[PDB]
Every structure is written in C-alpha cells, then in structure tokens.
Design a protein around this ligand. Structure first.
Ligand SMILES: CCCCCCCCc1ccc(CC[C@](N)(CO)COP(=O)(O)O)cc1
Lengths: 126, 229, 213, 417, 120
C-alpha cells in the first residue's frame, strides 16, 4: 500500500504537516498523488492533487489559499502542509494514486483510483 | 439519495433454536464503511454485539457471544447477515444495525473516537417456551377501606396473557380522567399480568355503572366486567 | 469492563444547567462519544471525539475533559431535552457503552395515597390468592413497601410495577402484588401493607382482617 | 430484464464473429467448385474488410438519431438472409459470391458499431466495465467456433454448401428476440492537432502492422498446413486444431499482457511501449519457425503456432491505455475513430489478396506440381515476420517520446479551463 | 450520638430567622436530613429535606419560595434559613436524620425540637 504519517490534535489557528510514503523500492512515478478527506456526517471528497511531470497543483474551492501540496520522488514521498485550521476541518485524511490527468472538476471523482491508503485523523479542538 | 438501513427477521423462537437477521442498506457506497450490530434488553441499557467490514476478514464479537453468533456480508446485494445459534432466555431484546467507519481499530486512539452515524429501527427477538392463551379478568372492588376523604378507588386485574399486548378501556372510552394502567410484569411461570385503576367521588358509586373492557388481539378475545361494591 | 456514570438520576427545571460525568479506566482515557435516547425510539449521535458537535445538532450541548473524567453539559434545558444519555468507549477490538443517566422534572414533595385490595371470590375459585397494595400520586420516586402477615415479614414473593411520569401532574404511582396459594391464604388472620417515604414521619399501615364482609 | 438484455446482446456478438471465418475453413473446397486460383481466393476476404471499413462510420452516425432496436434487427435479418441465399450460386458465376461477401460486410458493420452503446447506456459507472468485458470476450470464442462449425458440417453432410446454411436460422431467431427481451433507449481542429502527436502516430502505425500480420495468417494458415501434409505423403482436422488453439490463446495473451504491465508500471513510466515491443519481437522470432519446422515435423509447427499466437495478442488491451495517456479528454472521440479506420486501411484490407497474388506470381515461373504448390505459399508468407519486426520498431519509437507527450497534454488540459 | 438545635425564638411579622442543627457522635456526609413542623394542637408534617452533596434539596407546597437549607460537613451541621415568616408558621421544629443510602426514608434519629413564634 501507501502509508500516511502525521495527524493529531491541534487548536484553531494552528498548523500541521502530513506525509505519505511508499515502503520498499517501489517508485510510484507513472502517476501517483492526491489527498482526500471524510467527516462523520458526510461523504468523501477530494481535497487536492498534483501532476506527473510539471508540478501543477489543484485545490478545491473551500481550501484555496491555505493548504499546499508538494511531491518528492527521489525518496518516494508526498507532503501536505495545512494552515489556519478551523473546527470544520476535523476529519480523516487519505492518500490515493490514479491515471487521469490533473484538472479541475477531476478532484471530486474517486471511483477511478488505483491505490488507496488507510487514513490518518486530525482533530481541531477549542 | 438519502441514507436508509432496514432490518428484518425478528420474531419468536423457542429455546435451543436459531435465527438469521438481515440488515439492508440503501444510499451509500457499501464498501467504504463497516456494519455494527447492537441490542437493548427490555428495561436495561445498550450493549454492543458484533462487527463486520466488507472483506470478511475484519470481524469481531463480544465476550458473551463468542462461539455462538456469526456475522457475514454480501456486497453484490448490499446486505449484512447475523446468524444466532443456541439462543437462551436472556437474548430477548430489540436489535439495531448501525454504520461504522471500516478502519476504526487502526486509528482509534487517545484523541479520536469516531462514532456511529446512522441507525436502523430495530427488530424484536423473543425467546420463550409458552403457548398462546387468553387473559383472565377480575375486579378490584371498592369499600370503606378503599375510601379516602370522600374519594374512592377501584379497578380491574388482567392475568396470564401471551404474548403482549392487551388493551383495557373503561365505559367504552367514556371515562378518561384519572385512569392508570401499569406496565406489564413477567412472572416466573412465563406469562404476563397487569392491572388498571381509576378514582371516583365517593357518592358517584351509587349512580354510575363502571365496566372494564379487555381486548386481546393475538388470541381474538374480548371480555367485559362490571365493577361495584 | 464498564464505565461509571454519575449521577445515575437527576431532576431539574426548564432553563437550568445540567452536567453529567463519564468516568472510564480503559485504553482510550481521552476520547469518548455521547448519545441520547427517548422512550421507544433509536439513539442519536450527539457528540464525538469528546469535543466535536455532530451535524445538525443544537448548539447548547457541549463536551469537555478534566483529568481522566469526561463531562457533558446542557446550558439551558428545553422540554425536548428530557431523555437518557449514554457514553461510549472503544478500548480494543471491543466497544463498550456506559450505564445511562435519566433526566426528569422537579416539583414539590407529595405524600402518597395508600390503598389495599383483597382477592375477589373468583380469585379464590381459581385457587390462587392475590393481594394488591396501591400507592398513588407521590413524588419523589423513592419509596418502600413492606408486607406483614400476622406480624411476620415476607420476602421473595412480591412484585412491583411503576408508571412513567405523568404529563400533567408530574407524579408517580406504584402497585405491589403479593401471591399465595389458596391453602396458604386461608391459614392466616390479618394482612397488612406498610409504606415509608421521605414525606412520612411514621410508616403508614393499611390492614385487612379475613372473615369480614 | 437487464441481465436478459446483456445475455442476448452477448450471444448476438458471438454469432457476429462466427460468420466471418466459415469461409476460411472451406477455402480449399471453393477453389475447386469455381475453378479459381489464389489470386481469386484472396478477394473473398479483401472485399469483406473494405465494405466493413467504409460502412462503420455511417452506421455510427445513424445510431444516434433513430431507433436502435430497429437498426440492430434489420442488420441481423439482412446479413442472415444474404448469407443463406448465397449458397445456391451456379458454377459459372464467381463475381456473385464476392458481391455476397460485400453485403454481409455491411450487415455486420451495423451491429458491431451499435451494440456497445446500448450496453453502455443501461449500466452505471461501476458495473459497466464488467458488462463490457463480458461483451468483448466473445471474439476468440466465435472466431474459433467458425473454423470448427464449417469443417464439422462439411464433414457431416458431405457437401460444402451445407456450411453456409446452419447460421442463418440462428440469425433469424435472435433478430426477433432482440425485439422482445431488450428494453428501449469542428472535427478538423482535432485532426490539425492529432498529426503533430508523435506517440499517437507511431502507435497507430504499429497497430496497423499487427493487423496486417493477423489478417494474412488467420486466413491462409489452415490451407498451407494441408498442402504441407500432402507433400509428406501422410495425409479436415487441421482447421479443428487451429480453432481449438485460437480459442485459448485469445485469453492467455491478454492475461499475460495485463500482468506484465501492472508490475512494470512501478519501475519506470515507459512500461506500455516497452512491453508491447518485447512481445512483438518474441512473436516474430517464433512465427518465423513454422515455415522451417513444417518441412520436417508437424507437431513443432503447432507448438510454434501456439507461442507466436499467444505473444501477438498481448498488446490488445494496452493500446487504449496509450491513447488515453497522451490525448486530452475532448479529442478521444475523434482519435479512436480515425485510428480504427487507419488500422483497417493499411491492415488486412489488402493483405490476403497480396499473399495470394505473390504465390501465383512465383508459381507461374516454375513447373506446377504439389511440391512447388506448397513452396510458393511458404515463400509468400515470409512477409508476416518482416512486418512484425517493423511493428516492434514502431513501439520502440513510441517509447522514445512518451513522456514529453504526456507533459504537453497536461499543460493543454489545465490551460483550457 | 445526640442532636442539638439552636436558634429558635420569636420573630416579628415580615422578619427572618436562621436556625442550626448539629450532631455529636456521627458524620452526616453520607446520609440525608429532614426538617419537620408541628403546631400546638396539630400533628407533625413535612417541611424540607436535604440530600447528599450535589443531589439537591426538596421543599413542600407550604414552605416553597420562602425557606432554604444548607449543609456543612466540615462542621457536621445543617442550617435552615426561614424568610417571609407568617403567624401560621408558629410551631415547634424537629430535625431528623435518615439512615438509608437509597433515600427510602428511615427516620430513626430524632431531635428535641424548638419553639418558633410569630406574634403581632
Ligand atoms: C500464428 C497465427 C497468428 C494468429 C492469427 C490467426 C488467428 C485468428 C483470429 C484473427 C483475428 C481475430 C480478431 C479480429 C479483430 N480483433 C476484430 O476487430 C481484428 O480487428 P483489429 O482489432 O485488428 O482492428 C480473432 C482470431
């Protein structure tokens, strides 16, 4: 699989940084990365994605200007830097890899992914 | 689409038998979530029973059901099944199915605790060794020892009925002020009983006729009784 | 395994402030879920992760942590907030629920009304004697009923039944039934029901002497 | 019912493919009833493919606007009727049988274009793929059953005419059942950009090479084996064996290719063209050994057929992945159609005729005896390894530009929106 | 174990009073206590009850809105604070202690009572 690391309890106005890694000598470079989230009352939704060659990034409408996604395929890792967290950002975060190109209005679709992770939870306290 | 969960399969089974309950889901992607089975006994608190994810390798049972129950799933039809074997008299309860989060074991911790989102509505499972029967009705007759400061009390008593419920009325719905019906009590024998009481002014005992009217649906019976000193 | 909830029953008035405590000792110790149930329905997720409000729940509920204890708080009770409340923990591959605390309505103390009813003749024809002792319109709920057959105490052969709270009087009623065989019934002279409550300075006794009519 | 619709359409496809290869299985017999030579016996497949190639886009155009059940039923009825009525042609008229092949081509083009849309619109995003897989896995089965059915009926009745009459009955039945059990239901700016895409063009040329080899071999091998077995003086079981073999090589090739690609995608991002090229070169090495073993042994020829047969089919499901890896989402409708047309034009439209023509040209300059009758076809079927080697080279030239093409595609997609 | 009541006497109409009830030889932490009234020529009836810590205190219809109670387990004593006194309140007050851990009302240990008068 893929493996997610990070996650925890923060306070409003804090910050956090999650990482996803591929154990072994696997390279994960054909196409490989996007970040998703799920909350208790609602349905899963894509949060952001990054592209194979250029370094072209897309975010959803509700997280623009706060989250930042980045890639590093020398050591097979991907990073998500979350800032200015708020009590409605509390959820479980996942990591996925598929084949379709990186574009807007591709974020929300998660029925066509090849590999999924297992989750890491983030709680924003008061 | 709205999220729905519906149970089915509840009913009456004699001791030593077995049952199969079924929970059917509608509105979500069945293989991103897990299914939990919970039960509540008549007059007590909630208790957790069992757990299954999609892949039939994430399953779990509680200490008091291990070796007797068995849970399984079917993702083509979106259904979960619970198989109950070797039942006993202490399994009488109402059962609900609820929606989990599939990886609640792996990321439960110091600071998480995910929750259970949506619940079903419940099926009643009865475990008993009786035979259908009709209730016997008697009067609780007033007297001077039943009188208190010009206020008298009287009532009727219903005994030995199976299964529940029954219904009790007074003067065919006429008198509906000061009527108390108590919840059913289960004797050691295996049948239920209850009583109903009303209060009246002391003088009114000479002018009015009071009738206790008993209706019992499963055995199709009706009884009428007159109450007087 | 079991958590302890405190208090197991409390009474309050509309507009007041209520807090409930879940005390646990298992391998979470800092993350508890809280649910609500009304008579004859299904429960409803109310708070998760010890602090987070569910989706579409009124905002007057809150949860918090102190030491190893968790507390739930309602800041202004409303008529639809009279129910039973549970806490949940997940300490292994197992899950456990708490014991539940019930919230009722408060009023002024009312001493019960005590009545005694002997068997009818058809009860004797059946072969079983039943005696019914009745307490009516009292508050609070805690009360004690004792039986005396020729000034001897009986235990192990009585049953009690109690109604829910009244929707207009907000009072209680209790019925205690005592059963003997006909042979046992016809071998005594006096029967009596004795009642004690917070509102009675001395026990109230009601008697019945066989042979009268 | 939906399951009934899927089952009936799948059976329709099996019957669709059983009716292309009942002519190959009796080829040797036809060349004696009409007095023709190899030049004349290649046309029977060449005209079929030309008519199918030109018909398909028009019926795709029609199937969007009008009733689809009507058009499917009319197509099945038409080619069943023409196939049945073709088996009475008198000896003196050969051009009539070629015309019959053209008409059957039109009739099958209609169904092959329209049925996938009907299956696609009934189902949803998750279960559509499985239903389409069951639809498409009717190609090897029907293809092999063609050889088996033709040869078996000719064996039983004793007259090759009867090989052209069993199928129309089953055509008529399904043509009516598809009216009862089924429920009802600028391109120039793309061409100006799809010819500057080097990976797309090179993949299209490689697929055309595969088509050349497949069409020529699949029509001419069963007769060549018979000629070889006559020369050895130890001799219609050959077509039966060929059908039995192809029925299983069809599935084995695809499973092998998907497994190898799935593993290699986690080492580099050039997995698809490299796997395809390696398979093509191996298949060429093994194909070029039948024309040597058959002079000595017969079982060696069958084993070589097995291995080359299997390795030539491994790139069937990986060309669609290349096409959707390097082309943006609003040009794929144009790209698939142009690719399929071009695959037919340079593929097996004029391949069997060319093989037969060269065989006759060689033989006219040498004494006509069974030995040289066999050797002429042997030396005319050398052109399949040559074009397979070309196909391998084209897949390597695709793998050279794969990554730059993907980068251009991503820049375009994110710019447009 | 004895019960001592202090603070009874006379009050003018509209005044206030505060009386206390202490115990010797026992601790009132895990028990409940009750206050009763008895008028001359009248019987003994309920007035108020104080439970354990945090479990509230209950009043009756005849004293509601005027009186209150409180505990002090550090001094092992209870205190009743009576306000808005009226002539009909003139009576002898009794302080009693329940011995049950479930509040069933076993009033075993009683007191000597004390006189409270309202005169005009
Ligand atoms: C050593 C022999 C090599 C194998 C060749 C003979 C096998 C017979 C056979 C040929 C073709 C087909 C499938 C026909 C198509 N698959 C229909 O689309 C060709 O079309 P497109 O995909 O090449 O354009 C099935 C069996």
């Amino acid at each position: 699989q893929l493996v997610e690391s990070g996650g925890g309890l923060v306070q409003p106005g804090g910050s956090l940084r999650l990482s996803c890694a591929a154990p072994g000598s696997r390279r994960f470079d054909y196409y490989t990365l996007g970040w998703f989230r799920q909350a208790p009352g609602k349905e899963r939704e894509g949060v952001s994605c990054i592209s194979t060659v250029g370094g072209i990034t897309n975010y959803a409408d509700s997280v623009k200007g706060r989250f930042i996604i980045s890639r590093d395929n020398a050591k097979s890792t991907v990073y998500l830097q979350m800032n200015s967290l708020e009590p409605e950002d509390t959820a479980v975060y996942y990591c996925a890899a598929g084949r379709e190109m990186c574009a807007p209005m591709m974020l929300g679709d998660y029925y066509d992914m090849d590999y999924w992770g297992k989750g890491t939870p983030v709680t924003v306290s008061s | 689409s709205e999220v729905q969960l519906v149970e089915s399969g509840g009913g009456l089974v004699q001791p030593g038998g077995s049952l199969r309950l079924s929970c059917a889901a509608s509105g979500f992607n069945f293989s991103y979530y897990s299914i939990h089975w919970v039960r509540q006994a008549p007059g007590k608190g909630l208790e957790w029973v069992a757990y299954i994810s999609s892949s039939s390798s994430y399953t779990s049972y509680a200490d008091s059901v291990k070796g007797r129950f068995t849970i399984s799933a079917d993702t083509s039809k979106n259904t979960a099944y619970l198989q109950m074997n070797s039942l006993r008299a202490e399994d009488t309860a109402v059962y609900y199915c609820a929606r989990g989060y599939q990886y609640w074991q792996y990321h439960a911790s110091w600071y998480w605790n995910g929750g259970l989102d949506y619940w079903g509505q419940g099926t009643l499972v009865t475990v008993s060794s009786a035979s259908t029967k009709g209730p016997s009705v008697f009067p609780l007759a007033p007297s001077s020892k039943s009188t208190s400061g010009g206020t008298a009390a009287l009532g009727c008593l219903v005994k030995d009925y199976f299964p529940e419920p029954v219904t009790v009325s007074w003067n065919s719905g006429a008198l509906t002020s000061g009527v108390h019906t108590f919840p059913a009590v289960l004797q050691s024998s295996g049948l239920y009983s209850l009583s109903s009481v009303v209060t009246v002014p002391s003088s009114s005992l000479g002018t009015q006729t009071y009738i206790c009217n008993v209706n019992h649906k499963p055995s199709n019976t009706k009884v009428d009784k007159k109450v007087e000193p | 395994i079991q958590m302890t909830q405190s208090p197991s029953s409390l009474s309050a008035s509309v507009g007041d402030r209520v807090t409930i405590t879940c005390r646990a000792s298992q391998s979470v110790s800092s993350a508890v879920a809280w649910y609500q149930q009304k008579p004859g329905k299904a429960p409803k997720l109310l708070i998760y992760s010890a602090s987070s409000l569910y989706s579409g729940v009124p905002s007057r509920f809150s949860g918090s942590r102190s030491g190893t204890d968790f507390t739930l708080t309602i800041s202004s009770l409303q008529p639809e907030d009279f129910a039973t409340y549970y806490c949940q923990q997940s300490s292994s591959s197992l899950i456990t629920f708490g014991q539940g605390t019930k919230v009722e309505i408060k009023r002024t103390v009312a001493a019960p009304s005590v009545f005694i009813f002997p068997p009818s003749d058809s009860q004797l024809k059946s072969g079983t004697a039943s005696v019914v002792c009745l307490l009516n319109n009292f508050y609070p709920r805690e009360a004690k009923v004792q039986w005396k057959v020729d000034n001897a105490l009986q235990s192990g052969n009585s049953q009690e039944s109690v109604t829910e709270q009244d929707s207009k009087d907000s009072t209680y009623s209790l019925s205690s039934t005592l059963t003997l065989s006909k042979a046992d019934y016809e071998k005594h002279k006096v029967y009596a029901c004795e009642v004690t409550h917070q509102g009675l300075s001395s026990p109230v006794t009601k008697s019945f002497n066989r042979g009268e009519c | 019912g939906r399951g009934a619709a899927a089952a009936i359409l799948s059976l329709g496809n099996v019957l669709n493919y059983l009716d292309r290869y009942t002519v190959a299985g009796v080829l040797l017999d036809i060349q004696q009833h009409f007095g023709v030579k190899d030049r004349g016996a290649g046309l029977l497949q060449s005209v079929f493919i030309c008519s199918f190639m030109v018909a398909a886009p028009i019926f795709g155009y029609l199937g969007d606007r009008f009733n689809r059940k009507v058009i499917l039923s009319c197509g099945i009825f038409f080619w069943s009727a023409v196939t049945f009525s073709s088996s009475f042609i008198p000896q003196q008229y050969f051009w009539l049988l070629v015309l019959s092949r053209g008409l059957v081509g039109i009739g099958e083009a209609s169904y092959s274009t329209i049925a996938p849309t009907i299956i696609g619109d009934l189902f949803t995003k998750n279960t559509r793929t499985l239903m389409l897989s069951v639809f498409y896995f009717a190609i090897p089965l029907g293809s092999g059953l063609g050889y088996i059915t033709g040869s078996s009926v000719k064996q039983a009745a004793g007259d090759w005419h009867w090989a052209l009459r069993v199928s129309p009955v089953l055509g008529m039945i399904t043509g009516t059942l598809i009216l009862i059990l089924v429920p009802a239901t600028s391109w120039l700016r793309d061409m100006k950009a799809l010819i500057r895409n080097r990976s797309y063009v090179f993949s299209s040329l490689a697929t055309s090479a595969v088509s050349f080899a497949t069409g020529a071999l699949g029509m001419w091998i069963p007769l060549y084996l018979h000629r070889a077995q006559v020369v050895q003086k130890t001799a219609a079981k050959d077509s039966l064996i060929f059908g039995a073999i192809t029925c299983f090589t069809g599935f084995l090739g695809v499973v092998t290719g998907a497994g190898a690609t799935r593993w290699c995608r986690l080492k580099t991002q050039r997995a698809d063209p490299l796997v395809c090229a390696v398979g093509m070169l191996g298949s060429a090495i093994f194909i070029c050994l039948i024309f040597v073993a058959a002079k000595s042994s017969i079982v060696g020829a069958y084993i070589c057929i097995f291995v080359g047969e299997t390795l030539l089919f491994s790139n069937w499901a990986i060309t669609a992945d290349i096409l959707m890896y390097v082309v943006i989402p609003t040009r794929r409708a144009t790209a698939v159609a142009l690719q399929s047309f071009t695959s037919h034009l340079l593929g097996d439209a004029g391949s069997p005729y060319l093989i037969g023509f060269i065989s006759d040209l060689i033989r006219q300059s040498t004494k006509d005896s069974p030995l040289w009758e066999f050797l002429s076809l042997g030396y005319a079927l050398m052109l399949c390894p040559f074009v397979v080697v070309l196909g391998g080279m084209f897949f390597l030239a695709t793998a050279l530009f794969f990554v730059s093409d993907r980068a251009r595609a991503e820049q375009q997609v994110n710019q447009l929106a | 174990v004895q019960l001592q009541e202090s603070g009874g006497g006379l009050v003018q109409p509209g005044g206030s009073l505060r009386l206390s009830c202490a115990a010797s030889g026992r601790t009132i932490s895990r028990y409940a206590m009750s206050w009763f009234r008895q008028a001359p020529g009248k019987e003994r009836e309920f007035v108020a009850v104080a439970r354990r810590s945090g479990d509230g205190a209950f009043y009756a219809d005849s004293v509601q809105g005027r009186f209150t109670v409180s505990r002090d387990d550090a001094k092992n004593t209870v205190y009743l604070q009576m306000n808005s006194l009226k002539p009909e309140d003139t009576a002898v007050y009794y302080c009693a202690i329940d011995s049950d851990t479930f509040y069933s009302g076993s009033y075993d240990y009683w007191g000597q009572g004390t006189q409270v008068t309202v005169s005009s």
